[PDB]
């Protein structure tokens, strides 16, 4: 239904340089068109020869500084990068690789690790620096963290110091690795969000932020710090993150300004003692300026230095440090996503609203209005495909705010607008007004449509009347207080965008009904009751009725067989309109409104007992059954 | 006591053009110029007139058997006509300007009342409705609320977006269940310590203030926020180099600022309800 594109293989990374998309996929780097997701050009890195190995892309970076050029980074040749000098207005490909006569002991051109890596580009001080985070296991050159700058010759990389890179020591090489989730630049500092051990050999896993101001070839203020997303219970594993500004509304609840960066991050409580995330996701925002206060508040790093040796001020050999006191926020969605696995996160602002669209381990995409107050229902919710959404996403802003996020699901990267899928895709009346202030819908009698697109004089943004489809059960006991499930449409009130069951009242005949609001939804009403009466439902604007509900009198005409096995195990049949004899409950075989079949409890008696129905009103103890030894 | 003995057109009964048409459509009539009988007026149980621009409901007195009223989104400023509607059950006058709520005094059959967005300052009139079961006083200017102490039947109760600073009065409302205290100036919470029947709660976005303090280079204002057990709720995000040294929030303020603040957060569970007490304490400076 919306602009789509699929490759030959899964897309690992996506970037956008001037009206042209770039999809770094397996063995390929496609060049799409910003307007219609139309594939224009492409480059086949293909299955390369180490043995034969797939060229899973690990990074895409473009810089028009020197000359306009893309730079891809494979995974087969020691994670080496290659240049892509653009044509002119749109082949031609070089390769980053010198030799190490400088000294073979290292490899500045071996940029990316094949076991996960994040790469950032910045033009710091006349040169194009590369900030590389590599997840490393036991194998022989490849820095876990590195500030290698590019040369003006554009055919290799070069560090500047012995300490322009931090490496996890060999004994910890494979033991407890570091999965690099995401990285970004802010306030002159560079950051890296990582999942890892809690400490050396510690069973359970973690999640930390990493900061360091860089000059020439940095790592001078390097410093890790724990990030914990809790709700009122830790969500260790980090799943994805995005950095934008706060909507004017969010800026009051978290104390952030409207131009301050915010670290939106979707977390996930992991399985017992593992780093494998469960389908239980949280999420919270971390004001980058606030993060830069925890750091400014006053234990040696285990993996750089020796765990058992002792060692280690104001920055706009200079060693690195860790933190004991974790920085933490609360789930902004109150854990609305307690039983779902969130994989992607993107954040934009339309007015005051701070909507952030999310992905799921099941391809579920949705735009949810972020706010501490109420966990607003996704005004956009659907499935892309059976392939979980990727954390890789692009957020593009156009004039008068049209916007779109490029979401990837395996091979298919789809172009979704921020303005929502119109008003046409809204199902019910209440849901038609639940859309944000900017959408401007208007339920029109039967269908939902835009403002001036109403065929009849029934277009409105407030008046939604109730409607009862069916109720369960259809009847009730004389005095009994049976539970009621009343399914229908539009039971919530309109305002602040959100709808609740505040002004929701149920009326059974004349007896006012009692609603357990927690268990009730915008479509499912659960009341507890206690004739051939009618049912009424008010949503603050109007009401509806339903005249099937009856208060029938449960009665047992006759019972057979009348005698039975002394032990007990005969089928007892009741007639009329939660059976248990002698106290100890019997069992129900076939229920009805006319006939009941039950298996008698093997009681340790030889006398007779009354048969008691307990349908919310303990009713007739009709004709007594007799246990007797034959 | 209001009984039209002679067949009279609907236009003459209800002086307000809008409300007259409403009754017209209700009675399947052709126009406001159609005559109607008292019998036809008696059989009117439920009027639905939200957003009808109705300015007055003069003539409603002749509808004794009316137990459902919907008048949200009108211009209503008077409710004297309703003063003697014997069997009025549900009433909704939101987004109006009804203020002389005393006009409901003798409506002892009224269950669910709604008066949000009415710019209501005082609410004391509600005392005369100990039978109320659903109060809705959100989006107003209510300050005191000691009146509610006697509405000991309310299983629901709004109050969001006012200036309620003291909520103690709600203490004995144990028959409550759905309470909504958002957007207020809720500092304390020890109050609702006994609502052991709650199910839904909304203690969100408080905006408390303290009396102005003389600003120094080293400032310390005591934490005021309290939880349901009376424990000093720990400040989530303080502002301007602020640290929380229990129980006092301290600041390092070299130059002069007009005020400091600290947004808080502290999810609470009362009875069976799970809500999250949130707000922003603020301190004037000079």
Polypeptide structure, described:
The complex is a heterodimer of chains A (630) and B (286). With 630 residues, chain A is an all-beta fold. Chain A folds into four domains: 1-419, YVTN repeat-like/Quinoprotein amine dehydrogenase (Methylamine Dehydrogenase, Chain H), CATH 2.130.10; 420-464, ligand-binding face of the semaphorins, domain 2 (2-Layer Sandwich); 465-551, Immunoglobulins (Immunoglobulin-like, Sandwich), CATH 2.60.40.10; 552-630, Immunoglobulin-like, CATH 2.60.40.10. Chain B folds into two domains: 1-211, Leucine-rich repeat, LRR (right-handed beta-alpha superhelix), CATH 3.80.10.10; 212-286, Immunoglobulin-like (Sandwich), CATH 2.60.40. Chain B is built from three helices and 16 strands. Chain B has helices at 10-13, 17-26, 38-42, and strands at residues 8-9, 35-36, 46-48, 68-70, 90-92, 112-114, 134-136, 156-157, 178-180, 200-202, 218-222, 237-238, 242-245, 248-252, 259-270, 273-284. In chain B, the strands form four sheets. An eight-stranded parallel beta sheet of chain B has the order 3-4-5-6-7-8-9-10. Chain B is elongated. Chain A binds chain B through residues 231-232, 252-255, 287, 290, 293, 329-330, 334, 372-373, 460, 462-463, 502-503, 505, 512, 514, 516-518, 538, 540-543, and chain B through 46, 48, 50-51, 68, 70, 72-73, 90, 92, 111-112, 114, 133-134, 136, 155-156, 158, 177-178, 180, 182, 199-200, 204-205, 236-237, 239, 241, 261, 263, 265, 267, 272, 276, 278, 280. Chain A: One of its GO terms (cellular component) is membrane. Chain A: Belongs to the protein kinase superfamily. Tyr protein kinase family.
